Amino acid sequence: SAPGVYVTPKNSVSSDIISIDWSPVQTAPYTYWAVHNWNQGGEAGGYAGFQQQSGFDENGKRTLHFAVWDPISSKEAIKAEYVSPTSVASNFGGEGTGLKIQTTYDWKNYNWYRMTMRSWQENGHTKFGQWLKDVSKNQWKLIGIMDFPVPNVTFNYGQTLFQEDWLGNGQDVREARVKNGYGRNISDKKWTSWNTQSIEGQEPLNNNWDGGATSEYLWFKAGGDSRSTIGTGKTFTLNQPSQPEIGKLDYDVKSTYYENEKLNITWQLKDSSTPQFKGKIEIYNNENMTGQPINVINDIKSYQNGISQSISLPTNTYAKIVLTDIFDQTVEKKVKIKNE
């Protein structure tokens, strides 16, 4: 019974990547911030964000959320392709063929969290991935990947943030901040900057909410003694870069050996690295890695830190590891294949 509040980009478009930064300020129990929403009333309608479940603070249950409705064009269920160590997947939607992934995550008041989603095509299906950057720690994490049984779906429309009191407790204030809203366009693979966004209470009759902007972020609240200073809603601007600030992909090879016809190669992304999206490894018979590789190991997954493969190799081979991040930046490493 605190009113819902929406923060909606004025000029968003069909996207394959969607990103926003969020920071909680006041956190009543049973507050859900759906910082990304897409395709409502269309195929693969869904949302993702943060939730204060029990409590008012860090001692209560805090989580990330990610849900996608029952597929419309397929009778089949969405599968949890990846869930992180603190994530749990469950059935979701009116007929239980949707999916939600809830992740225990110890996010903190006044700290910033980047949530970046990506959708892509794989094996005739659409995959939806959730990644989270803990800005203070400067650490990315892969959260979850859903395997949706219909090809060619993206984040087509519907971009908005919603702050909801789901249980009824209008007397507790809930407040948070957002910034750095960007999407990557399906049309041309360029970025769209959500520099202009409207803050609007879900019911124009109820003024128990407020919003505004500093030069760094948009802020919004509902509940308690909140009283709108911006009427029924208002548009605010942030003067942010036209392109998002993307980090660098950096990693280290940890093992590279061949023995009893089994090749083992492992790597580890640096703690500050952008997260891994895909990989391949090309194996050459010469150090300069000229000509065609004698072998390729393809389809290394976002969540894959190594290969273990039975393979016939000559005595002196050289491996070129090619990793690409969720922003399609590629970084290569060259290593000689030992006999551990």
Number of helical (H) and strand (E) elements in the chain, helices listed first: 0, 25
Q: Which of 128, 125, 120, 123 is nearest to 99 (CA)?
A: 128
Residue the block writes with tokens 């500050």:
272
DSSP line for 192-239: EE--EEEEEES-TT---EEEEE-SS-EEEEESTT---SSTTEEEEE--
Best CA proximity match to 138, nearest among 274, 2, 253: 274
Provide φ and ψ at 3, rounded to 5°. Answer: -70, 150
Whole-angstrom Cα distance, residue 245 to residue 196?
18
Q: Cα(101)–Cα(252) distance, rounded to whole angstroms?
A: 30
| Cβ-based burial of 283 (10 A; exposed 0-12, middle 13-18, buried ≥19) | buried
Burial environment of residue 124 by CB neighbours within 10 A (0 to 12, 13 to 18, 19 or more): exposed
Question: Which tokens sit at 284?
Answer: 């050459």
Residues 65, 250: Cα–Cα separation, whole Å: 28
162 touches 34 (CB < 8 A): yes
Integer Cα distance of 113 and 135 in angstroms? 6
What tokens were used for 132?
């989270």
Distance CA 90, CA 325 (A): 28
Render 71-84 in DSSP notation, one character per residue: -SS-SSPPEEEEE-
Query: Which residues, including other chains, have CB under 8 Å from residue 232's CB and lie 6 or more apart?
Result: 200, 201, 204
Distances (CA, A) of 130 to 20, 36, 39, 72, 265: 12, 11, 16, 22, 26
Contact of 267 with 252, CB cutoff 8 Å? yes
For the chain, the first-to-last Cα distance in angstroms comes to: 64
| Rounded distance between C-alpha atoms, residue 149 and residue 74, angstroms | 6
Technique that determined the structure: X-ray
Task: Report the C-alpha gap between 285 and 72 in whole angstroms.
Answer: 50
DSSP of 137-158, one letter per residue?
A: TTEEEEEEEEEESSSS--B-S-
Q: Measured between alpha carbons, how far is 328 from 326 in angstroms, rounded to an integer?
A: 5
Q: What is the dihedral angle through the alpha carbons of 223, 226, 230, 234, rounded to the nearest 10 degrees? A: -30
Query: How many C-beta atoms lie closer than 10 Å to residue 314's C-beta?
Result: 10
Report the distance separating Cα 248 and Cα 228, nearest Å: 41
Angle at 254 between CA 248 and CA 259, to 5 degrees: 140
Tokens of 53: 């479940």
129 neighbors 144 (Cβ within 8 angstroms) = yes
Largest CA distance in the chain: 77
Start and end residues for every CATH 2.60.40.10 domain found in the chain:
251-336
Residues 221 and 31: beta-carbon distance below 8 Å: no
Which CATH number among 2.60.40.10, 2.30.40.10, 3.10.310.30, 2.40.50.140 corresponds to the domain 251-336? 2.60.40.10
> What does this entry list as its resolution, in Å?
1.8
**Which H/E stretch holds residue 89?**
strand 87-92
Alpha carbon distance 74, 86 (integer Å):
29
Nearest CA-CA partner of 240 in 204, 289, 191: 191
Instruction: Specify the DSSP class assigned to residue 2.
Output: P
* Distance (Å) of CA 337 to CA 255, 282, 316: 9, 12, 7
d(CA 30, CA 63): 11
Cβ-count burial of 303 within 10 angstroms (0-12 exposed, 13-18 middle, 19+ buried)? middle
